[model samples]
Target chain A: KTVVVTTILESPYVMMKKNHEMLEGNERYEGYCVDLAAEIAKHCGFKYKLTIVGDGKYGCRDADTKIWNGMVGELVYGKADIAIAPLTITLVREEVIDFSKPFMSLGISIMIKKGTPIESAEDLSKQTEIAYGTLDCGSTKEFFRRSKIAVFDKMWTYMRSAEPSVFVRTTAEGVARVRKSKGKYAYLLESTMNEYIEQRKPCDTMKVGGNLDSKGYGIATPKGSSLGNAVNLAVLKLNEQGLLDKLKNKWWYDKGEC
Target chain B: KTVVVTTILESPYVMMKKNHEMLEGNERYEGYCVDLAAEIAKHCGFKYKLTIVGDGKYGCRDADTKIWNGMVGELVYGKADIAIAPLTITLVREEVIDFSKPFMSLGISIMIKKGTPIESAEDLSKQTEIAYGTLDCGSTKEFFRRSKIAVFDKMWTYMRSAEPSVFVRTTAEGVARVRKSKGKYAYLLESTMNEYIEQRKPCDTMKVGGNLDSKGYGIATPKGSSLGNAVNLAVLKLNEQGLLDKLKNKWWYDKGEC
Candidate 1:
């Protein structure tokens, strides 16, 4: 049986080709996550179909209604057998579904306009004069919110109460907010994304901070799924074979950002 | 005030001097754990006295009485401020005390008499003909006991039902069983200890099997202690400074089983 996989269209992880309209099947969606899904299926002896998460945003719980949305929601609701996106593993999500051993590990970092006067997460937490925000309702934002550490706990308080206009609706929006605000605002994101963005053209933004916290992007499966064990073993096998690193270099370095 | 710290006397972690009657204070102990404890105290701004665990065993709950013992018990009952032994972290222990980030990571492995037929944990699990045992009720043993994975779970069943005569009470006892019993017996231990033992003279034992599972040795403190964060950060700092590796080489390689 072919497993149905869900992913997202994040740059470096996935991108639409200039001639994407002419592509089909695997060619239509080929990036880091797509490659990983293919390798996992190969190792686990299954075929698969990849579908992009309809909304570009990582899905999360609707605070008012308590229902989940996005790729994460799709896995939670059993619409897909696995989620191969650059979805982060968090304490909240861990309670709902199981995540395999991390295929990609990264830290939460912040991108600020050049000359923002912030050098680390510590610096951002201590200063109130500069405004900062993370991708709306995402793991990075939730990490800051749930942190018990002094610096991060303080930053979370400031972010939770900041005016809506001061917050960003997406990572791109937050990066743009920093770019246009001329060092007045900072955007928080995973280090991998921040590094990818730093190398782009018109790169006026730079990542600051010794990572706020360590986390991993993992292939997630529903709780008690029989495929969980095989998939987890496949991730470890891929790591041993250096396939994961090969895929990362393929997308992040070999295939330059759009 | 000098902090009273509890430690344990395990080969390559701590050893008795040949002129033991003349040793005093810090001179009584030497090895990776000793160096780590000193570094932690220095970084955290505390002076300390090292008190060895009264019993020469890693901590665990007694199955018969349901009472905790050794250095772990000392910490649980508030007899010491912290413990800096080669203490392996386990899920059961995490419920009672907080551990600092791991100082060193390793995995469970098997130590078989040289020329034994067993090649892996799976080989050991498949037969009762070769008597095998672990260090009575500690982390390595519990890893096999609580495992839900294939080889380990099967081994767990064998270990639990093995005759009392087949079980060894300590690592030393288990090693002796392997040495004296020729190729009829095997010992299961942490990979670090197995590696350390492999390099020693009269190497009648060799580690067989890829690691059964990954875990780490952590510096543990009583639950809710203010010292947990400082100790954890100190461990990370020590890792960054390369002191941890230096200490490992000093104790495991330079000392050579004392």
Candidate 2:
């Protein structure tokens, strides 16, 4: 059976022309992960269809029912053959799904519209108008709940109870809201994604300062999946052969967007 | 029993004056440690007699008979009460005696003539002249004999088999050899002692490059000495009160020469 690969359609990881008139299937996709998944499949001897998860979550466990959600839940339920997006390798998630060593280094990043008084997250709380939010029910929301890194805990409290609601259902919606609000909205998202968007058209959103913390993304399979071993080694060879870095340069900078 | 402070009769720490003709007892010598010792005594409520160790080595174990020697030996054998000098607090010594947390820090440093081509210890071995020597059985000697930095394992081989011995009997002898040889010898010794000497005399020698390794000196006592607790606390207070830094300045810098 052909492999069913599940991923999020996060920009730069996976992005398409808004309402592409002609492209279909995998042809409709192009970004860092689209190229990355192709290389992993080539090296691991697998044929796969890259499908975007119906829900645009990076995945985390729900505290109430202890349910795995996002791309992570897909692997746990045998719904997806492998997930190759910026899915974080985390301790809570690892108990259910197997992950290859990170194919792309990732971190929670700050994306600010072109000009703002903000230089760091520490500055984010002192100002208003720029409402900040994390993707609802994803690693970003989970990160705020669990992280002890000062402003994250502060951000969590602010986002949890703000009168107007700051959280986003998906990363694209968050990015679209940020772009629509001019400089009135910001989206705290992952690296590579936020960084790639900063270099895209309009280029109005620049990732200011450094990442708040670090985690990396991995290609994940079901806990006892036979594909785990080969996929793991394939990632290192892809990295060693400079294919990952090459793909990063290609999708992020090679072609002209700005 | 009175606290018999067994210190080494090294320059600046406890030197025999050119004409100690009039001075005697504690007045006979003075240095960074002599001043630090007095502060400890006043603060810790104990009188200490600073006696020189018969064997000038700082401390080491004799592998053959497994006997301890140097300032460390005096404490192990009840030869003295407390040791407050640039006596490095090393593992072999700690196994036999107790040391208060360091009141002074020091390191193995290099002494070179005014215009020697030597910039580092590695430079010392690169050229034939500017002969390098360390005090025999001293910490600096042990450093070269078992170092892993800077071809030190490589340099140690040359040092052990030098034609007529590259070992000094004392820090003074090493300094004397460097002065007398003009620009033909370099002496490796402790930072505080070497720095003290550099600030004195003909002003011909200067410490070159950085230290080979770092170590700290502590006020030492027997493993179960009654004074250990009070003295250790006193040192912290002295440090907090800036007395340790003040003493270092008093002996090493405030009395500086051109």
Candidate 3:
């Protein structure tokens, strides 16, 4: 059977090749996750196809509507058989889909201007001088909405009530907000992306302090799929053999811009 | 004038070359601080005489002699014009010397055997199943020795009173202890070293959770040294120009083993 692997067009992870207009099939797309999916499929002894989700969200729940959106919606509504993107494994998502062992590890982190006075999460939560917020879509924003830690909980209330809207529709927009905000705004995000952006050109942003909470990105399979168990084992095998680390180097360090 | 820079000979930071007999002066040594010291001197407009501290400690106070040892002592006694090692900026040390704005940031972190059940510092502090510890000499040990954080306080009490001695004499020794302990022991040290080691051979251990505390390493000078202020501004300049990040990549990532 030809398996369907759903992903997103995120830089360094999944992207249309520059000459994608002249290519077809999997050859049209390339990246860390693209290479990663090929390795996984080879190990699992299956042929697979890649598809990007229609909506470009990382997966979050609507406040009033009990429905999921973005990558989660694609998986839940049966449009894809598997997700091999940088989809974070969250509590709410697990209830609806089966996530294989985490393929990549990350955590919520703070992004600040090079000279920002904020030292830790507590520093941002307590002050109004430096405005801070999360991406309007996905788990990072939800992390704030449901967090119980004193500093995180306080910051959520502040972001929720701030007169100037702090949320952005995309990571780039949030990052642009931070870079152009002088030292007056900070962006909260997953550490993996934060560190990746830190090494990029302009080099005006930095991931400060330790992550606020720990979690990881998992390869997702729809509930009751026969592939879940084998896919999970494949991830652990790749990790043990050091292939995951090698791929991370190929994408992040080997081709680093800054 | 030629400035005298004092530093410690620690793994990955500063170490004698394998073929030391054929080398002389600065060429005899290599690692993070060697490259770092060169950069700092260039930016601050001076040539330097790099000397290794006679004792191999990161710097700590002696309770008995009321004397300082390691790099801090070399500077306080007017033996070295500056210290460009991983000498942490501490309140106690600050009284005896001036420190440049931290050249690199780090914090105390946890180390465990791969597949170990530990997830956070609190996870280790509350259990007796796995033996754990910090280096006998360094800010990490001092962190627990004087910590007021509830979980850290509990860990300090346990490590201080535990039998069979959990303290290690050096970071290398601590890493060795973690590797050889099987599933029975864990080591705690600065995140910088922990991460650098994680990228080395065997790849058998992992850093878990956020660090126990946040702090940084600074270039140290004796109290009222003429070079202190200029050195501080130079560090900020290097940081702004991306030279510090470049130096980090040159030493740590470009040739990373794992």
Candidate 4:
């Protein structure tokens, strides 16, 4: 049986090569996830097809209908056999699907213009001189929304009620806002993306302070899927072998401009 | 039915409170895990009984007999309903038991006496003057034993064949060896334990370099156990609520001496 892998098209994780339009099937894609998917299939002894998630979402459940959407929904609906993307491991998602051990560690982090005075989430929350927000419909936003921690909850209150709406439709939008805001806008995003952006050209941005919390990204499969065990072990073995670190460096640092 | 919580006596996680002999049942034990167990049960709506792991091991499968030992074994064999300890989440362990999403994050770390020349695992692996070892039968030891990373594999080769046997039977012994070895010994342990020791009275030790790898400790139960869902959610909620951070501060830093 050919395994179907659902993934998101994120920079360095999944991207179209320069000659993508001339390529066919799996050859059309390149980046960290493409390499990882091949490694996982080899270790687990399976053939797989990679498909971009239909809705381009990480995954979330609608409040009213309780229907799952995005890459996670693809698994829950049996549209894919596994998810080999930067999909975050979250409590709600765990209930509907199974996540292998973390393949990469990250946390909510602050990204700021180079000269911004903000050093921590608390610093951003302490004043309105600089406005802050998170990418919409993602774990970073959900974290602030669901957090009962005084600092995060207060930030959530401010964001939810802000006059101009601080939420962003995409990570690129948030990063651009910080770049053009002239030190007035900060973006709350995962450390992985924050660090990746910090190394790219036009490096007027920096990741500040320690992460607000810690978690990891995992290879996800539907609940009770037989493939979960072998895939999970593959991730662990890869980490022990240092391949994950190598992939991270290959994409994030070796490709760095600054 | 009452939940049977199996744990180990690790400092600031599970410990015998002063005047323990006069107390009965759960009252005799107190620490971060003790507090966390209560929060988990409260959120999940369950009555629970806490019991110390009988063998005092962190749980490992015997290579020959294939039998599990320690808190994990207790859960696997139905001796306990759940395990709430500093038990590491590992690929091997996940085969026999289900672990909740991580309640705490840590990684293999280096502990050196103050002023030691070592700054990273690479430094330790390159030098023979500073001897180092890990606690026997624990995740740290297993990590080195299983690692194929160049630096870690080299370190493992040295530790496994070192003269006088660098392995210690307990973390206390490992710390003692570092303290008294006059800069001749370093200890490889989890960052959580290393940080705890750095703040203790003697204050003659410090954690050096970035962590070797990232992993976490999770609450565990037998595979497919019904309590897995609620308990896992409870941990995520607690973390988002900031209770995990509070508990960590209350136990690790607030009790600091140096």
Candidate 1: residue pairs that collide: A59-A69
Arrange candidates by TM-score, descending. 4, 1, 3, 2
Q: Write down the lDDT that model 3 would get.
A: 0.82
lDDT of 3 by residue, A1-258 (tens): 788888987778998999999999999999989999999999999999998887877787777998888878888888888999998866567768877656676778999989999889988987898999988988888777876667888999999888679998878888899999889999999888898888888989999998665556889988788998678768756754457777887888887777
Candidate 2: regions farther than 4 A off = A1-258, B16-24
Task: Assess each model's interface with DockQ, reporting 2 decimals per model.
Answer: 0.04, 0.02, 0.02, 0.52
In model 3, which runs have C-alpha deviations exceeding 4 angstroms?
A1-258
TM-score of chain A of each: 0.92, 0.90, 0.95, 0.97
Q: How would you encode candidate 2's per-residue C-alpha lDDT over A188-221 as one tens digit per residue? A: 8887788778778887788888866545577899
Instruction: Give the number of the best model, judged by TM-score.
Output: 4
Top candidate when judged by DockQ against the true structure: 4
Clashing pairs in 2: B4-B81, B130-B184
> What is the per-residue lDDT of model 4 for residues A1-258, given as tens digits with 9 covering 90 to 100?
999999998888999889999998888999999999999999999999999998888887888999998998999999999999998988878878988878898989999999899989889889999999998777888889898888889999999999798898778899999999999999999999999999998999999999888788999999889999899889977876779989999999997998
Per-prediction TM-score: 0.55, 0.50, 0.53, 0.95
Candidates in descending DockQ order: 4, 1, 2, 3
lDDT of residue B140 for candidate 3 = 79
Model 4 regions lying over 4 Å from their true place: none
The runs of at least 3 residues in candidate 1 whose Cα sits more than 4 Å from the true structure, single-residue gaps closed, are A1-258, B254-258
TM for candidate 1 is 0.55
| TM-scores of chain B, in order | 0.94, 0.92, 0.96, 0.97
Quality of candidate 1 docking, DockQ: 0.04
Residue B15 C-alpha lDDT in model 3: 87
Better of 2 and 4 by lDDT: 4
Per-candidate Cα lDDT values, in order, are 0.78, 0.76, 0.82, 0.91
